[PDB]
Write a protein that binds this ligand. Structure first.
Ligand SMILES: Nc1ncnc2c1ncn2[C@@H]1O[C@H](COP(=O)(O)OP(=O)(O)O)[C@@H](O)[C@H]1O
Ligand SMILES: Nc1ncnc2c1ncn2[C@@H]1O[C@H](COP(=O)(O)OP(=O)(O)O)[C@@H](O)[C@H]1O
Ligand SMILES: Nc1ncnc2c1ncn2[C@@H]1O[C@H](COP(=O)(O)OP(=O)(O)O)[C@@H](O)[C@H]1O
Ligand SMILES: [Mg+2]
Ligand SMILES: [Mg+2]
Ligand SMILES: [Mg+2]
Lengths: 526, 526, 526
């Protein structure tokens, strides 16, 4: 293969550690309320600004291939943490560096770094256990706003808006985040099944106020194929006019003579019909029409396999909806009736798809908001006066959102970094099998102090003193680095989801303890 | 990814600040009446000359990647301001530099630049509030010519011609700007229903002078389909020859046997017919033809909503009409009857839409020019002796136009830079939460002085003397830098639209305050 | 975008001025009777020699990007002048340099170069006014030959031959210029209808001397389609034998049985017919045959739309010509009768075509020459012993032609450069609004002296002595630099069209006064 070059022992360890230390030093300035931002040059556009640890970590590759090995491993931990939890990234990085340094330093001739790894892993299990003991599940929706506002770097309006959306959509409902054009944040809430397609003809309009077509207690007709012929359209209208209900028709397109029947029967003898194009993306629209079919109760016409033809309809083949609103741009359907078991089956299906298949073709999420919209969904239109600002704020909002979900689903524990600090006594009551494992437990025991010392150090104060003042102090009290003084932690609102504290530490130790086992590294020649 | 290189703290800040300062220094020479032009090399052609801050800013990228980061952020400011307001670009640039410098200088170890950002943004909100209090909405059309003339760098003829066009088409009517072939400026006004399509055959000609079709009290025919067919044309001509009136026919195309009837039968006892292609281009042409339909009052043929066929016409068909003039390139219709419910329906439609698809789809204005063309539209044919001159003058005219629109839609406030200067006392009555925010408010307090000091500095005078002379002076008085002495501002005509002053400041502070938060910069290696 | 580099103030100004001065110094050696030529290397061929200012200016681009900016602006001046007037190019360049230098030098800190520009433009308006006052419209056809001979650098034979062409074709008729193979210039004048197509068969020959078919008082038949069949051709011959006239037939082709009828009736009962191919391209042929239709009076057969078929002809559907001569290679038709109004309509149509016709396809002129014949066009076959000679000379004759047309259409004024010198007192009676404008008027006042001093300097004499001596002298007298002494200008024939003198100065001052406004220059890095 390709010509290569290899390096041996503490020399190579010192190089890899140089890389780790560089990347860690770059990410770690972002940590905490007094933390600071990192600008990253973009190849094509104006540069990114961020406070996100993982996005800083991913941005840094290095010319020196060994230092690049270290860097790649630490960004691996930060990425794993971001994927598994969505916050706590800088924390995972500084933890990983601490384990890597303290690991590397203790290696000698007689030492057995694999066994030391076993010891640190023992220490991590023992720590997360005590963390779970410390966890107190969220209750009041004030705590939601607290976790959100702290995860959003002290922006109270963010955690307020998140609390509102989570109240009005539910704690495990769908919230999504997107760019505003407005200079301020907006919470929009959609209920129903909205999609971005409008009436084919203006003539369908009934209200003249807003220029909408508004219907209630309506029927739905779903066609996967185009409907140009009269032959397949007419029975669907006779059946609709029969039971005196309005009919909405969703199709790949509605045109030829069919549209002529629709807008003649519409303008004359005042029939209540609308026709709108299918949401429309090739094979995607098929899945969407299947979604709306299942939600509104009823079936899709045209070619799947079993073909149901448009000429032979029955009232049980249509759809039934509480309300419908359509405009030139978009269509919303509301309170559609169908089997709730079967629709939750559908949502369970799409989620179980998406989770094993995370492409950057995220229309699978666009499905999930739609079929879940009969509880509701919240859109978070983030503001700001410039794109880079909105990207920063949106990074923070997504962080706070993921943090709140982790909080509701697992629990909350003390903020600052105190939650890890309180786990040290649990390590003190361990029973190491040998010197190596004891070294591992010592490594983790030192490493737990780090996040608080870093958050304090960013504040401009004597962080490692502050850590010790915290340790002499009671369990409920910690250091408010923004206010610059000690406080009850949970009372003052400084709290972290347990899931994030668990995952950051677990990933960081998981990769770094493996890194410390290295004795020889092999790299490509420039 | 690509190999990268990172830099830490006030060093990287000093580099980025070098970039900011370079670009700002380049932009700032253009500012005010005594400002000066910037030549920019073009790759293919002869070089640009400009006084436009944003066009100077976009032209400058830098080899040093950090300085280039600063530069790119400043271009973000100037571009955002130009997009959102269309003037005030140089102002936004010098403001952004001032906030960036004064920001960077005040950071230390104990400082919290994000919180300083919060203080700055507080200060900007507090300032724009007082700006809105200061705003006095435009009334006399002398004020229009004043804001135009100041935004056009003292060219009175520009603001005169803009005032004339805005009078003759209305303050929210359509004005557009284009190159003359003439050495002087011209105002042309189009009235009617103008669109860019010319005959189909030459044999139609009636006046021989200009080679136009000039018709009066004519008929109009509207066909969404091609008219190539046998006997679908004839009743429309028999009915036209009946009431001895000329007919213009607009269609997707007119050709085959139809055209053969039209000519040669045009060349017979001078009855007047003309045929022209529909304004066209796919799905747009339907909306355009419905526009001309509703304007002349009713009109439908071709395939359908409600179906009207071309064989069955009546003398009241389909809309009417007044006068018509068409040439080889373009067609104009004039005196359409009845109508105004549907046009107000149209403005009600455009005002309610575009808000969705808000991110590039300005064709809604292309609609608005058409359906409002029975009031008018203005073309601004700018003159000059050379293309580069023409591009300069046109840049200035477009600036003055956007400025006049911002003035009519939001308000006017004091020129010079005094409007920002008067907002300082509003900052003096603020209640900062902490030292960081106080630093921010101080930053804005200093930065507000900048535009006035810069306009004076370009004059060759002691700008910061003049700033303080203005501050000691009364609210109504400021510095006329062209005349070189103090005057009543509003009386002398030196006034700025409030929209431009708010948007420049908001964007500049918005990006620069984010820039000051940086602690680490990451860039690609050369 | 692309990495760039910027420069500030008089430093950058001195570089741009270096470029301007280089290009100007190169062009200016060509000026006047004692001026000299410039050789320009061609990439592919043997080098150009020229006395044309604009062609020198366009040839010079510069490595130093700033100097190249200056260079691009001055060649912009020379190109604008050549496009707008066709002579006076060197003059426009030296004027532009003078305005640029005198502009740049007068700039300081307190100065306002845009306002200085305003003063300059004021001065130029004031100058061209007095120029128009000085203008005396051309009368005698001696004056045309004078303007031509002076614009052709003293070649009397050029202005003689141009005078002859202008007499024999008219003052606004068509003269064109092209290479001879003869070593001397020749004037050919074409009138009639010439095109390069010959008899299909030798049997058509009538003269036996030259082998031509010569006809008079003939008919012409025009067929856009092929003529193979008998039944379409025969009535056209019966109608010809009826009225005992010769028949010329022009067609896409004439062959099959038709041709057999033609040369049978030709060879056995000496009928007077010839048949010739259409001038031939594809779509061009339609316009050519319809041209010949319109010229000869009559109509084209075959399919346009309304189709007239060859079976149904009438004598008023043919064509009628004073004379016809045909050979193996070419066909000439003479004194064709038709509506002169309709033919002038046709020429008015083709000129209005070609003028807006962004075309490398010059056949529109090849059309225009044809339909203009028997009104006439003159071709100027320029001689010389070598291609480079022919091209230089052709440049000069084209200059003289454009100059004569400018003279007839606007006027003539004093040569030498005296006409501007006489305009200086008009500057003396101006009322400047401020110091800047006064600087501008002073700049123009100095620049006006330049062209005469340059023409004198090229002579090898003390140009600025000569300028002041002419200024001390009376209005009618100036300096004959070729004869080397003072003379009455108009009497000795040294005169310049007013259009060229106005346009050169107006363009030069127009861009240079803009150049002087620059404070910052931005250029791409090598
Ligand atoms: N006022 C505060 N006092 C003490 N610690 C805080 C305060 N606000 C936030 N923190 C701590 O900051 C940490 C969050 O780090 P952050 O900068 O959001 O990056 P990440 O979440 O990716 O680690 C949490 O562990 C939290 O305990
Ligand atoms: N005669 C004048 N006296 C004082 N200030 C002026 C005068 N003319 C224009 N200004 C000021 O110049 C500013 C406009 O700057 P300009 O050169 O148009 O660049 P931009 O508008 O792109 O920032 C306005 O704020 C206005 O107050
Ligand atoms: N015999 C002459 N005496 C004085 N001036 C002359 C004479 N011949 C030509 N000129 C001047 O030369 C100028 C023309 O310059 P020329 O060399 O033709 O290049 P261009 O026409 O491109 O400027 C005219 O202004 C004319 O007055
Ligand atoms: Mg976070
Ligand atoms: Mg401006
Ligand atoms: Mg000449």
């Amino acid at each position: 293969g390709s010509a290569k070059d290899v390096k041996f022992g503490a020399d190579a360890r010192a190089l890899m550690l140089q890389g780790v230390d560089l990347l860690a030093d770059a990410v770690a300035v972002t940590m905490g309320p007094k933390g600071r931002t990192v600008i990253i040059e973009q190849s094509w556009g104006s540069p990114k600004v961020t406070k996100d640890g993982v996005t800083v970590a991913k941005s840094i590759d290095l010319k020196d291939k060994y230092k690049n090995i270290g860097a790649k491993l630490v960004q691996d931990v930060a990425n794993n943490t971001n994927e598994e939890a969505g916050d706590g990234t800088t924390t995972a990085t500084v933890l990983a560096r601490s384990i890597a340094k303290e690991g590397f330093e203790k290696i000698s001739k007689g030492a057995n770094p694999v066994e030391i790894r076993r010891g640190v892993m023992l220490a991590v299990d023992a720590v997360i256990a005590e963390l779970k003991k410390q966890s107190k599940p969220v209750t009041t929706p004030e705590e939601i706003a607290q976790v959100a506002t702290i995860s959003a770097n002290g922006d109270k309006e963010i955690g307020n808006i998140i609390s509102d959306a989570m109240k009005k959509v539910g704690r495990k409902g769908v919230i999504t985040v997107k760019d505003g054009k407005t200079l301020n944040d907006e919470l929009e809430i959609i209920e129903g099944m909205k999609f971005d397609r409008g009436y084919i003809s203006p003539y369908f309009i009934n209200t003249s106020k807003g220029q909408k077509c508004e219907f209630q207690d309506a029927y739905v007709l779903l066609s996967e194929k185009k409907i140009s012929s009269i032959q397949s359209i007419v029975p669907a209208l006779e059946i609709a006019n029969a039971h005196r209900k309005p009919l909405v028709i969703i199709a790949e397109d509605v045109d030829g003579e069919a549209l002529s029947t629709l807008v003649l029967n519409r303008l004359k003898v005042g029939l209540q019909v609308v026709a709108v194009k299918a949401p429309g993306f090739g094979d995607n629209r098929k899945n969407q029409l299947k979604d709306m079919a299942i939600a509104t109760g009823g079936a899709v016409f045209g070619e799947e396999g079993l073909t149901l033809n448009l000429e032979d309809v029955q009232p049980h083949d249509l759809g039934k909806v509480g309300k419908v609103i359509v405009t030139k741009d978009d269509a919303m359907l509301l309170k559609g009736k169908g089997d709730k078991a079967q629709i939750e089956k559908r949502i369970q299906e799409i989620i179980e798809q998406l989770d094993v298949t995370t492409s950057e073709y995220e229309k699978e999420k666009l499905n999930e908001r739609l079929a879940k919209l009969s509880d509701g969904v919240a859109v978070l239109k983030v503001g700001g006066t410039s794109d880079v600002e909105v990207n920063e704020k949106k990074d923070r909002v997504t962080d706070a959102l993921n943090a709140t979900r982790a909080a509701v689903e697992e629990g909350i524990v003390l903020g600052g970094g105190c939650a890890l600090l309180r786990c040290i006594p649990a390590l003190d009551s361990l029973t190491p099998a040998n010197e190596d494992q004891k070294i591992g437990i010592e490594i983790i025991k030192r490493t737990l102090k780090i996040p608080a010392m870093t958050i304090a150090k960013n504040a401009g104060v004597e962080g490692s003193l502050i850590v010790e003042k915290i340790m002499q102090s009671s369990s409920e009290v910690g250091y408010d680095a923004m206010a610059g003084d000690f406080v009850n932690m949970v009372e003052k609102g400084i709290i972290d989801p347990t899931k994030v504290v668990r995952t950051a530490l677990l990933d960081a130790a998981g990769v770094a303890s493996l890194l410390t086992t290295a004795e020889v590294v092999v790299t490509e020649i420039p």
